[PDB]
Scaffold this active site. Structure first.
Site, PDB file in Angstrom:
ATOM      1  N   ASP D  64       0.839  -1.187   0.000  1.00  0.00           N
ATOM      2  CA  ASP D  64       0.000   0.000   0.000  1.00  0.00           C
ATOM      3  C   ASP D  64       0.861   1.218   0.000  1.00  0.00           C
ATOM      4  O   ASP D  64       2.028   1.167   0.293  1.00  0.00           O
ATOM      5  CB  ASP D  64      -1.030   0.018   1.127  1.00  0.00           C
ATOM      6  CG  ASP D  64      -0.392   0.108   2.536  1.00  0.00           C
ATOM      7  OD1 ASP D  64       0.761  -0.360   2.724  1.00  0.00           O
ATOM      8  OD2 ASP D  64      -1.052   0.665   3.440  1.00  0.00           O
ATOM      9  N   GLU D 119      -0.196  -0.907   5.803  1.00  0.00           N
ATOM     10  CA  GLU D 119       0.913  -0.508   6.590  1.00  0.00           C
ATOM     11  C   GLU D 119       0.893   0.991   6.766  1.00  0.00           C
ATOM     12  O   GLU D 119       1.383   1.488   7.795  1.00  0.00           O
ATOM     13  CB  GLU D 119       2.192  -0.909   5.899  1.00  0.00           C
ATOM     14  CG  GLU D 119       3.438  -0.608   6.706  1.00  0.00           C
ATOM     15  CD  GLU D 119       3.899   0.845   6.619  1.00  0.00           C
ATOM     16  OE1 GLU D 119       3.738   1.548   5.585  1.00  0.00           O
ATOM     17  OE2 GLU D 119       4.434   1.307   7.618  1.00  0.00           O
TER      18      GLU D 119
END
Ligand SMILES: N[C@@H](CCCC[NH3+])C(=O)O
Ligand SMILES: N[C@@H](CCCC[NH3+])C(=O)O
EC number: 3.5.1.130
Lengths: 349, 341, 341, 349
Positions: D64, D119
């Site tokens: 991400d 994250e």
């Protein structure tokens, strides 16, 4: 007469502010021997002169240092001593530079040398004594810029003493005592500066330093005193800075201001500036303009001498006032070389 | 012996902490003369004793003062001097109250008098000297409550030395300021919504800067019941990074005793009979009550004529009339609790 | 027409700044009915007029309120609602006082009634509309003084928009905080030792952060006589580096009129005759008195029933009895200064 | 399958936190083709595996990015893209490194690859999904350390929401309004941190950031809310930091804490650390240990996996989250080279 051995002997003569006579005499001797007609003036400055030209240039350094000798040693390529950098080295480099001046240059220039007294104190007595007596066309202030540096400006200064006295009372009542009122003022000054400094480069920041704080052991009264100082950006000269500090002070607090010095930031492109740019290149270096956080006689003299002015000297200014203060001999020598070149280039216009 | 002239002569003898001997001497003298078997103990306390009865009552005051002598004078009905209120006044009022006890009360009570040394100092040496040398059933601490006032409690205390040591961005002094400002902000947040007795009080006593670079501060905290010394120490050391060194000393536990007690009832009667309206008080300073509670698990209050807002001020005085009412109230309270036994 | 029920119906019509027309309508209606030649002007002010005499008296109030409607009710002798005190109440009290003027007074005075628009906004459009359209000899501003109170002064004002714009150490929002904290510390130092009327008041109205990075604050200062707008602006711009952009608007000059005046004397008599003890007051907010002093160089006070501490609160109400006393006092004061002329 | 073209296609697939599926599928494909048996797990992680050895090593990155694409271009030696540095590049470098692993090394090691989701959000859902399912002997976290850097630690984190609501009242009364009470809390937090930070290196400082502030236009009530966050030194883990912030908050202020992450600082000398030191030398560089001001899945995973762990990745972390984020291709390639070497050296013990 050798540059480094003459400096060493300068460093060996202690000269805390106010006690410069011995070193002035020494510097004046050496100048006498080099043909600079050295003498010691009414303020104890080391004075000299060379040349008969119509372009007046003043090379002004200071011969006082912060108190506290450090044993002098030449060891490695490094010469250690109180003043090595700030600023006996720079002024001695001025002396030898002027001493090796062309006949061509002694024709265009009259070069005045001033080893000023009390530059490290609030007075700057020495620079102020000489200010109404010389009318330079150019001035070079002897402070450590590094041998490749040309410094264009120095911050101003304000010294502040703040005092609170009041009747003593029990430490358990919520009312602040005198020391606490002073702290609270200082904290207000911090907040003021933090706001004043938003987005600002260091040369443009207001900086403060708490120098001392005393509290009287209270009996019938509380007394507290606080000494701090500000280094002043160009946007905030001393009289403006006094209005600010006064507005942030409650009427219970007594203020005394002193050591007012105006900031100075000179333009990047003058005859003087090109002269040093060229001399540093000749001597095989890359010139860099500098602005400095400290305060110098450049600030003191700017209001009196409306002329192009820079600060130059070999050595690293971050060694000011430290116990291992020193200059690289090879740097000191490049320093002389640069001063001479700059003078020659000045004379060549 | 005249109460006011005796007090006056007490004020006229300087007794800054540690130098109480001369005035203890004078107080012991006076207590002899009054039939109170006056003497000076090993801790240089002024001591006295009256009565024979089973129930021990300690009237404990202090005889040191903070420094700075105030010229002693009687003027406009006020007696001015260092200790007038804190706390030569209250102790002298205790001496004269004891000196006029009924023979009835002198058989119910044995009453001990202690003019403690070093109460103004961290040591409280005086009071700690007698703590294990007496076994009170009741105790009265001589600190200015006001004559109509009875003091149920005093805040605890903690003293702190903070030190910071560096090499010559911000300097040692400035870094000590940052600590001080944080602990202030902490105290304000802890105090929001609390009455003064329940507030933490945080005072800068001294700030010393020595041009390596080194600076120290000394702080004085007064501590509510919800925040005794070891708790206050946990906050302060948590907010100090290892680079700021803290020393703790002068720890005293807060104390706040109950509203209804035989001592308490005695003083309310004594006060009413002297023509006043009795009022419970909590005091924001610290006293030998805090030093002594942990040793004497018995009912305890503080009492004395005078306004505690004058503690440590340069115009310290007690009103003469009020001082005499102090004597009267004390005596009656002592009398009232001889009757309950 | 019943005073309280008329007021009630006024409260029941929302009139946030800029949306005063409906209530002006209602007020104009009511003033017609009372023989006060009611109408609505071009600035949407409620207007009324009574009398024929040479001496012009302006009773000027405002008819807008801050937003947030309070359910209107009569309860426990109190009339609750937005504007109850600030300032529909005072204006209605002015309407009814005017409506009951003696025919003697209606020949000495001509009395104009202005229910101004947008007084709660920076514009004060309402009051500025009539400023050059009337030529008062006296003026009364309808703001809650308390019924026994006569208000001599209101602080000036300055509004400020601060903006900071950067690129994504501390961010734009934090830098605006530093400015705010400095201006607060400045205000505290300027205020030490001053009574509230002479203090600078510095309020954060809004703080907007927009995730370059950009943040703005809006501030609201109330200004003592010693610090009018252009002076306050010099301080604030001096403490802002060029990187923080300031906009100024909403400037109003402080005003504080003299204690002894024909207006002033009239109200003190009127108040005494209504059975009260008159008291001069200085108010810490700002009013159309500040907007109007520079245009009307004439004696001026503010008056109205109600407690100004309820301004802008969610329980705004006036006591009914007090409101009626407001009517009575106004009428008598108007009466008293017809007698002096 | 070429390293840089595979990365480019990764960068071209937007993957703001919560929306990683498309890129996981892509990464899983490439891993399938390279012999890493790629798949997408229940949390949308890109998963892979290679080797059959008894020494479990996890190479865990995140797939991400912060929201907001930047157009992808390979231009000069620089590849531009959201994630180039943080951290699609690092994870792709893990993939190719593992793909070129010795037979000798596939004998000693079983290497698990995890392209973790979320994250960049408070959850770290992906790393947390995988935490109870893998029992590594060693773990390498894919975040940009520079190709010559081995990062040993990352600071912890705390997110704070503070709220004040109260009855509305006139802006001219001296009592603070809700927004001002919140400011005053924040200012108290600044003072607390300044004291906490005396003498401390940046990795050991408490750092704060005001993220958002909202004030309700007041009618009957005032409402203000404030969002800030702290980066946490090892001396102040999240639960300690909550006690501090709570003690500095008056009872009028409502606090909500979240995104708690513990700091992590690993020792300088482990098998893993020597393995990377050696691989960077082989690849012709000078290894430097780093401690980082940011927070990563290293913090998230440390409490679960009590084993030697470092963070590695090509690229310059100061380009995190900027509009011109990119990595030098040659750096990216050295990155792969270093990962492989490190794995080989691990297997050679
Ligand atoms: N009563 C004094 C001293 C307290 C310490 C007891 N040894 C004060 O409030 O400062
Ligand atoms: N009276 C209102 C508004 C003042 C502005 C006048 N246009 C206040 O105190 O905020």
């Amino acid at each position: 007469l050798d540059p480094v051995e003459f400096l060493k002997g300068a460093l060996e003569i202690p000269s805390p502010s106010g006690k410069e006579r011995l070193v002035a005499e020494y510097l004046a001797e050496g100048m006498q021997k080099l043909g600079l007609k050295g003498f010691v003036d009414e303020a104890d400055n080391a004075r000299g002169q060379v040349g008969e030209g119509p372009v007046q240039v003043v090379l002004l350094g200071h011969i006082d240092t912060v108190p506290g000798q450090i044993p002098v040693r030449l060891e490695g390529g490094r010469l250690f001593g109180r003043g090595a950098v700030d600023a006996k080295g720079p002024f001695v480099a001025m002396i030898f530079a002027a001493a090796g001046l062309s006949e061509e240059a002694r024709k265009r220039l009259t070069v005045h040398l001033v080893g000023a007294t009390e530059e490290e104190a609030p007075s700057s007595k020495g620079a102020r004594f000489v200010a109404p007596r010389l009318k330079p066309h150019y001035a070079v202030i002897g402070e450590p810029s590094g041998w490749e540096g040309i410094t264009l400006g120095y911050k101003g200064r304000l010294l502040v003493k703040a005092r609170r006295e009041k009747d003593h009372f029990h430490s358990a009542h919520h009312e602040p005592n005198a020391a606490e009122e002073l702290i609270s003022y200082f904290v207000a000054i911090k907040a003021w500066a933090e706001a004043m400094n938003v987005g600002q480069r260091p040369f443009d920041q207001v900086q403060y330093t708490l120098r001392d704080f005393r509290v009287h052991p209270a009996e019938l009264r509380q007394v507290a005193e606080m000494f701090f100082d500000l280094r002043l950006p160009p946007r905030l000269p001393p009289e403006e800075a006094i209005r600010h500090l006064t507005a942030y002070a409650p009427p219970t607090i007594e203020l005394e201001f002193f050591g007012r010095e105006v900031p100075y930031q000179g333009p990047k492109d003058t005859p003087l500036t090109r002269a040093f740019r060229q001399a540093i290149r000749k001597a095989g270096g890359r010139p860099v303009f500098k602005l400095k956080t400290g305060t110098s006689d450049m600030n003191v003299l700017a209001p009196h001498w409306p002329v192009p002015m820079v600060a130059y000297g070999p050595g690293d200014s971050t060694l000011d006032h430290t116990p291992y203060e020193h200059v690289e001999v090879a740097e000191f020598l490049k320093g002389i070389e640069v001063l001479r070149g700059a003078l020659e280039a000045l004379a060549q216009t």
